[PDB]
Write a protein that binds this ligand. Structure first.
Ligand SMILES: NC(=O)c1ccc[n+]([C@@H]2O[C@H](COP(=O)([O-])OP(=O)(O)OC[C@H]3O[C@@H](n4cnc5c(N)ncnc54)[C@H](O)[C@@H]3O)[C@@H](O)[C@H]2O)c1
Ligand SMILES: NC(=O)c1ccc[n+]([C@@H]2O[C@H](COP(=O)([O-])OP(=O)(O)OC[C@H]3O[C@@H](n4cnc5c(N)ncnc54)[C@H](O)[C@@H]3O)[C@@H](O)[C@H]2O)c1
Ligand SMILES: NC(=O)c1ccc[n+]([C@@H]2O[C@H](COP(=O)([O-])OP(=O)(O)OC[C@H]3O[C@@H](n4cnc5c(N)ncnc54)[C@H](O)[C@@H]3O)[C@@H](O)[C@H]2O)c1
Ligand SMILES: NC(=O)c1ccc[n+]([C@@H]2O[C@H](COP(=O)([O-])OP(=O)(O)OC[C@H]3O[C@@H](n4cnc5c(N)ncnc54)[C@H](O)[C@@H]3O)[C@@H](O)[C@H]2O)c1
Lengths: 248, 245, 260, 248
């Protein structure tokens, strides 16, 4: 009997076998959660990657920028686990920022039309996903989305950082709204995962940080999807090896 | 002499006499500062507003959602202050958020498009004014923005907090760019300024019919008296954010 | 299985059956933990509270201002759990501050001697216990202490608020040390828990913090149930928050994340 | 003229001319304030150090660990500054922590008795000075303290960091009391400076940072003593070149 017995859990973000949405989904099922998976564009590719999970699940199409996808979303999830069954958990593990405002491109050279699409998919779609799903969730349930410490600036991360800071604010409001269903909303701020800054991360981490290992981040999302943190919401747990709390 | 003596400062945001920007300029001039100002929609009416500010200042047009105003800014300023002179300070007192994304209007019924218009103007616009004016700014310069503390969610402000949360991030990134020029970038988290509880939590009280202390603090950031603060946030809130109860 | 199975956890800070430490322990066992308890002063009276847990476990003396108690704690634990065995968890649920620096007493009227007793017991102890129990802990182990968000000033808490701020700083440092041993260090900030006797002002002021907490916490908050705090602590002691240390998890209904 | 013209202000912490208090005093005087100066032990050397200040100034004694120096503080100042008058500003720039609680000595080996003394001098004494000098403080006045960002652990600064976390907590509480007198209390969190015995900082700093130069800090402290940060209390202004706002 693992952490997630009898729990029906939605999981977005699976694109590659190296995705955090993958290791989270794999770990959930490894603990009893019966999963429902969602996918963005390459519907048939990620179908073949989900098949490599310990167990199979009703993968569903979900482009967060498409309004019809959200409207339908809820009722389609009902069809996959059977009507009169609701969701105990949901996982938002999605992000997107065009090269224009993220990476090597100067912070100033990023048009708003590029940034807004970055914030649409990475921040706003947290609320929108909650909106589409709360109605079909059970009390004592959990919504958990991916974060990356944005409280300070850095190279490359540029406007994605600004999207994460948008997310954090969005998390706190979704919590307000989510509380009416007896639902908790939290963010897991992870350390950098392969999918200077990383040689220093593992230094700063008092227990180390292995950027090739996404399992320690998944275990932490399962804890948030479990009943063992029933009094925390609108909040950020940090799975970065303790890096953020260490200057040098 | 004044605190902003012989520093040429740009001040946006003015729309009425209550307006944060209005008091900021007002004090800046009292502090011997030679100003430049920018206005948004009702340009014509806002000249009958800028008239009261002690001295005469060149009211240039600026719309942070308009790409052309931005490209022509440095040229429309450099000329206002005469070729050969650059700015020493920049003030962004600009915010907007459609009604659907605020107040009693549910959080989830805000269409992205409204929220997007709100981020562009309230958060992104800070980076775009910086891009436009860093090239014509002197070393020892200071850029400043108006912030409303978004660390915690609250009633009514809704997506504006999200725009404010985005704005604080952006600010840190503007500070990197401005560093290349020896120019600083900071926000001022103001308490309510009308355009009970706060007066309570605030150990020195708080008066939301009075914008001068907020206005004063924006002047300090423009001064040479905080030469080591950058990509940071100063609270002009009567210390309310520092008290639980 | 149980969430904490075959884990040898040392719990500290049980004085009455309302103690947070009593429910951390009560839950710990429901979830399979094998416990070693530490008690402070009235050592006889607390035996009679520990009896009434899910299961009887060894009570040990630990006056964390006694340097002798620390130098012998590790051997006394090892002895209680059997040679060859080591602790997998430690819980610091200890705190103290005189009426002088906490209550209706003016902030400026707490003589430094009292404050110092409070800081020793409420913050420094965390570094001592950690120092004493770390050499007998398995890699993967966990240390958690109880905290109460000192970020902002408030009425009454006064100098204990300062102790908590020092405790958070001491936590961050302890993490550095326990990491060598493969042990995580974390604190749990809990909303206020039932653990006008003071008077008109206090019975009101404090009646306002419990009116306010429920209000602000988006999933509400119950001043009478320490169970959700006990579950939070069990999740730090578990293998399901292994990437997190020197940090603070907030089991307070999410109230600290809301302004009103 | 000056920023602090004709303001009666006290300043503690001067032991050499490298001291942050010396440059806070120096600039305070370059701006036309009248100063009272306190000194811990080497009174005949802080004497000889202070001669070399823009204007001559009263140097009364004050070991903040002495109940009597504190008990007699208000009256000794009220004499130096003359009867009928009061202070407009107070500068706590005091801090100390035994060898044991810093540097190469292992964080676990500091006896509380050492930790305790350093918290007494660095953190607690701020409430004392506030307590001692507040009945002799005019409305619109201002208390300020020196801080080093203790929000994340680091090596070496060790137990002093715990003292600074405490001092910040103390700062917010001293503001409660200060407001009653119409006064503000604030810390200036400074970047490292070459003091008698006290890199990445100048790198992280968007505007860089020189640790042999304390003038930016004194300018900051003065800006808290001025009338130009009137809305700011219980808070912490960072004079560190934006360092803390960046990660790399
Ligand atoms: N990997 C890291 O180093 C790291 C660290 C901290 C946080 N994060 C965050 O974790 C989350 C997971 O990302 P990842 O690291 O696994 O990268 P990833 O590329 O594997 O996953 C990102 C996902 O976002 C999805 N996506 C993009 N646009 C979408 C849309 N319109 N609708 C639905 N889905 C869309 C992609 O399809 C993809 O599955 C992201 O939010 C990211 O910001 C990643
Ligand atoms: N009033 C407060 O309690 C308070 C508190 C903290 C922060 N602030 C911030 O201070 C700033 C100014 O607010 P205020 O209280 O002076 O109100 P205000 O009405 O006087 O100022 C708002 C300004 O936003 C400008 N604006 C909107 N859209 C624009 C666009 N497309 N292009 C250019 N300008 C545009 C308007 O012209 C106006 O000048 C805002 O950013 C606000 O968030 C206000
Ligand atoms: N009750 C709340 O709302 C609340 C909220 C947040 C945090 N906490 C924290 O939980 C912890 C325990 O609080 P509680 O509510 O269980 O109260 P409690 O009175 O039941 O526990 C305090 C414990 O400290 C122990 N103690 C005192 N002096 C000691 C000494 N020097 N050596 C060893 N132990 C000593 C006592 O024996 C007692 O068990 C404290 O750290 C407190 O700050 C309580
Ligand atoms: N230099 C830095 O890297 C740095 C950075 C941030 C903050 N600070 C802070 O600035 C403040 C002043 O230190 P500094 O950098 O000028 O170095 P410093 O050595 O020149 O100043 C230390 C002062 O503390 C005083 N002091 C010690 N015991 C005292 C006592 N019992 N009573 C009264 N005063 C006592 C000393 O007399 C001395 O004047 C300290 O609080 C320090 O922590 C320093």
């Amino acid at each position: 009997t693992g952490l997630l017995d009898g729990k029906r859990i939605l999981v977005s973000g699976i694109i590659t076998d190296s995705s955090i949405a993958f290791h989270i989904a794999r770990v959930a099922q490894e603990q009893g959660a019966q999963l429902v998976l969602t996918g963005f564009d390459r519907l048939r590719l990620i179908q073949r990657i989900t098949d490599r999970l310990p167990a199979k699940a009703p993968l569903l199409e979900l482009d967060v920028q498409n309004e019809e996808h959200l409207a339908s979303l809820a009722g389609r999830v009902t069809e996959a686990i059977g009507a009169g069954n609701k969701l105990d958990g949901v996982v938002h593990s999605i992000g997107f920022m065009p090269q224009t405002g993220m990476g090597i491109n100067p912070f100033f050279d990023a048009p708003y039309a590029d940034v807004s699409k970055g914030i649409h998919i990475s921040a706003y779609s947290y609320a929108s996903m909650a909106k589409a799903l709360l109605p079909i969730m059970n009390p004592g349930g959990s919504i958990v989305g991916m974060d990356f410490d944005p409280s300070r600036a850095m190279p490359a991360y540029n406007w994605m950082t600004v999207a994460k800071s948008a997310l954090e604010s969005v998390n706190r409001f979704v919590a307000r709204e989510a509380g009416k269903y007896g639902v908790r909303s939290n963010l897991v701020a992870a350390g950098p995962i392969r999918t200077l800054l990383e040689e220093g991360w593992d230094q700063r981490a008092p227990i180390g940080w292995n950027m090739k290992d996404a399992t320690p981040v998944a275990k932490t999302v399962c804890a948030l999807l479990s009943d063992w943190l029933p009094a925390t919401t609108g909040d950020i747990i940090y799975a970065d090896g303790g890096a953020h709390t260490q200057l040098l």
